[PDB]
Design a protein around this ligand. Structure first.
Ligand code: 4D6
Length: 267
């Protein structure tokens, strides 16, 4: 009933925006879920950076890395869309800060530096997600090529379901010990790029941690979220979208509406 009525609403919404909308949502209290195109491939865009940050945290927990270690890059020709790393090029950044900059501002310099030095490249990123039991996620390329979002390209894609599951395991499960889980959660809560997406879909008194992506082509954008309603157990919301032409812009409102619909479905 709720599930099928929500499916129709998403379907109407995808027609309205002339693209594809992928949704998976979990009510972690009741266990109810809702999925719309939840096993179809969508480009990760910058949304994988949320998991990159969690991979760094796991390495810290395992004492392979120090969260406070300086990361220097004074000669680097910094990638486009590096709002945070650009400013600290002079003096370097702690490993922790660089990871949270990749998360909270989608910093491209932070992302590539971390992947080249600490994570084993896209192959290493993919290995991390394999290790949490995520079999759909794949990172093939580096910044910024990973963002091309060409229809049919399976490079740098996952499914809404897998993203939902993996976020649940990482933010709420026991991949990260208690202490490092708390840091991850605080990182997600202070994300800056998601004001117009899932954060716009919920009451002002709910607490949200999220991670967005915006490929900047083929109207491809996404958001995933952990949501703490006031009186209840948390929700997991995962929204991914694509569009038909290269020049088509993404739609924050469509992502926010899709979230609204998904939350209703599981509520
Ligand atoms: B990434 O895909 O996602 C970030 C997501 C967000 O909403 O914060 C933004 C930066 C990344 N995308 C790009 O680098 C944008 C580009 C513009 C021209 C080529 S890539």
């Amino acid at each position: 009933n709720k599930s099928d009525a929500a499916a129709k609403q998403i379907k109407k919404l995808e027609e309205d925006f002339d693209g594809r909308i992928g949704v998976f949502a979990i009510d972690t209290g009741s266990g109810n879920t809702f999925g719309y195109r939840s096993d179809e491939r969508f480009p990760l865009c910058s949304s994988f950076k949320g998991f990159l940050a969690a991979a760094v945290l796991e390495r810290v927990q395992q004492k392979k890395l120090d969260i406070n270690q300086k990361v220097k890059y004074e000669s680097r020709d910094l990638e486009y869309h590096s709002p945070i790393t650009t400013k600290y090029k002079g003096s370097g950044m702690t490993l922790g800060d660089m990871a949270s900059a990749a998360l909270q501002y989608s910093d491209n310099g932070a992302t590539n530096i971390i992947m080249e030095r600490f994570l084993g490249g896209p192959e290493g990123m993919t290995k991390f997600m394999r290790s949490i039991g995520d079999n759909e996620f794949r990172l093939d390329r580096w910044e910024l090529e990973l963002n091309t979002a060409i229809p049919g390209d399976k490079r740098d894609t996952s499914t809404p379901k897998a993203v939902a599951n993996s976020l649940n395991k990482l933010a709420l499960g026991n991949v990260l010990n208690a202490k490092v889980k708390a840091i991850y959660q605080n990182w997600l809560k202070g994300n800056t790029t998601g004001d117009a997406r899932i954060r716009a879909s919920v009451p002002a008194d709910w607490v949200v941690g999220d991670k967005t992506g915006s490929c900047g082509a083929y109207g491809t954008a996404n958001d995933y979220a952990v949501i703490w309603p006031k009186n209840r157990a948390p929700l997991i919301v995962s929204i991914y979208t694509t569009r038909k032409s290269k020049d088509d812009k993404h739609s924050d409102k469509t992502i926010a509406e899709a979230s609204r619909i998904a939350i209703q479905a599981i509520d």
